[PDB]
Each structure stands twice: as C-alpha cells, then as structure tokens.
Amino acid sequence: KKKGXX
Amino acid sequence: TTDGVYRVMTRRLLGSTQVGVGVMQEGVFHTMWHVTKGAALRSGEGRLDPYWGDVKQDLVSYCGPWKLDAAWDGLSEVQLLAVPPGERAKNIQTLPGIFKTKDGDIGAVALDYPAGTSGSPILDKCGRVIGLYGNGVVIKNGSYVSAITQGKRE
Amino acid sequence: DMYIERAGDITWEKDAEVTGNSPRLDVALDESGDFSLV
Numbered sequence: 001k002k003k004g005x006x
Numbered sequence: 007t008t009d010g011v012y013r014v015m016t017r018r019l020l021g022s023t024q025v026g027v028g029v030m031q032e033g034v035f036h037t038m039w040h041v042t043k044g045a046a047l048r049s050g051e052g053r054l055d056p057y058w059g060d061v062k063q064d065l066v067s068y069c070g071p072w073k074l075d076a077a078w079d080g081l082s083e084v085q086l087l088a089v090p091p092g093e094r095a096k097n098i099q100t101l102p103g104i105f106k107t108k109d110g111d112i113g114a115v116a117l118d119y120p121a122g123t124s125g126s127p128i129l130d131k132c133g134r135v136i137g138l139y140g141n142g143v144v145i146k147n148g149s150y151v152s153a154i155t156q157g158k159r160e
Numbered sequence: 161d162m163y164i165e166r167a168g169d170i171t172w173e174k175d176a177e178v179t180g181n182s183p184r185l186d187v188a189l190d191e192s193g194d195f196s197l198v
Contacts, residue, residue, distance in 0.1 A: 001142055001194060002040050003150040004121030012164040025162065029170065039193065048163035064193040085176055089167050097173035100180040105187045105195065116180040133172045143187060143195045151183055153195065 007033065007049065011089055011127060014041050024091035027125035029135055034070040037125040038140050038155065042066060064141045065157045075159035076134035078102055078113040084154075085129045086115055086139055091122040097129075105153055113154035115139065128154050 007030060014026040014037060026041030035047065035054055039061050047054040047068060059066035067073075078084060086098045098117055105112040113136070115128060124140030137154035144150055186198040 001144065001150075002038075002121060002124055002140060003118065003142060003144060003152075006121070008166060010169050011167050013167050014162055014164055016162045018161065027167075028164065030166075031170075035164065042162060045162055048161065054164070062189065062191055062193045083178070085172055087168070087170060095168040097176040098180070099173075099176040099178040101182045103181065103183040103185065105185055107187055107189060109189075114183070114185065116183055127170055129170065129172055131172055133170060135170060141193065141195065143185070143197055145183060145185070145197075151185065 011087055011095060013089060014047070014125065024122035026122055026140070027089045029074065029127050029138070031135065032073045034073045035068040036072060036074055036138065036157070037066055038138055039064045039066045041124050063157060064155060065138070071160045072157035073159055074135045074157060076130055076136045077156060078130065078136050078154055082131060084115070084136065086117050086126060087129055088119050088123055088126050088139070090120055102154060103151065113137070114142070114151050115154060116149060116151045118150040
C-alpha cells in the first residue's frame with residue numbers, strides 16, 4: 001500500500 | 007538544501023537503494039513517515055534532524071515545521087512529479103479521484119509506481135505542492151490508488 | 161543510514177503525459193496510518 005507488494 | 011525534489015537513499019542494503027522521495031521547500035525537507043521512520047538524514051556533509059512527524063498522517067518534516075499548504079481544488083488536473091528509483095524525474099498529469107472518509111474527502115491519484123517512489127510531490131498547475139504520493143490502497147481489481155497526502159502548515 | 165540526492169525542480173510540465181482514472185472510493189484510515197477499503 002506504500003504499490004510495489006502493498 | 008536548494009528547493010526541489012530529492013531522492014531518499016540508503017546504503018544499508020545491497021548497493022545503494024532508493025527508499026523514497028521528498029520535497030525541500032523553505033529550508034524544510036518533507037517526506038512520508040514510512041520512508042524514514044523518522045530517522046535523521048545526511049545531506050552531503052550536513053545532517054538533517056527530524057522536527058515533526060505523525061504516523062497516522064504518514065508524514066515527517068526535517069529542519070523545521072511542515073511548510074506545504076496548497077490543496078487540490080477538487081476540479082483541475084494535477085501532476086505527479088514521480089521520481090522512480092534509478093530513473094529520471096517525470097511529470098504525469100491526471101485528474102484525481104477521491105478518498106471518501108468519515109473525516110471528509112481526500113484527493114487521490116490512480117498511478118502505480120515502485121515503493122521507493124513514496125514521497126514524490128503532487129503539483130497543481132501553479133507548481134505548488136498539494137501533497138505527497140505513496141499512502142494508498144489497492145482497488146477491487148488490483149490497481150493502486152494513492153491519497154494526495156497534505157500536512158498542516160502551523 | 162539515509163541520505164538525500166537532489167533530482168529536480170518542482171515545476172508543472174506543459175507537455176505532460178495524461179493518464180490514470182478518477183475513482184471515488186470509500187476508505188478508512190486506521191491509527192497506524194493505513195488506508196483500507198470499506
């Protein structure tokens with residue numbers, strides 16, 4: 001979330 | 007310490023790694039908390055010390071209080087000044103969507119970039135920074151949407 | 161130990177590529193700073 005794996 | 011957009015690098019992992027991006031304005035460096043977890047930063051021979059941070063807003067400022075106070079007008083297209091790892095800074099124009107929350111509505115941009123792009127600035131047509139890219143969600147179809155995350159200028 | 165590297169001016173680019181849509185999403189922000197879909 002930060003989407004790279006998230 | 008010139009104004010502008012900066013990569014946030016670390017040499018703790020293999021080689022040199024870009025963990026995020028930030029904005030230098032008015033003597034203050036602005037990035038997202040999850041990029042630095044509030045650590046101090048080297049800028050050449052000098053050191054930047056954290057000054058303000060908030061995990062819930064996912065923001066942090068160095069050398070001074072948060073300076074960026076422009077806001078999306080809710081109508082106009084904006085530009086992500088994306089600074090991807092290992093790649094040149096590039097502007098991407100888009101019309102923001104909206105995060106609807108119990109505490110009001112937040113602009114959001116549906117642009118997907120590497121993790122180390124976190125902290126790249128989102129700009130209005132006057133070149134003012136309306137927020138930082140990289141705190142978001144993944145939509146029912148697997149696409150990424152980032153809030154336009156803007157701090158408060160004390 | 162982290163360091164910064166200048167990458168550019170902060171400026172609007174007249175000829176910029178346009179892309180991405182404009183989703184309207186109900187979300188929640190938790191105390192850890194994570195957004196979630198409702």
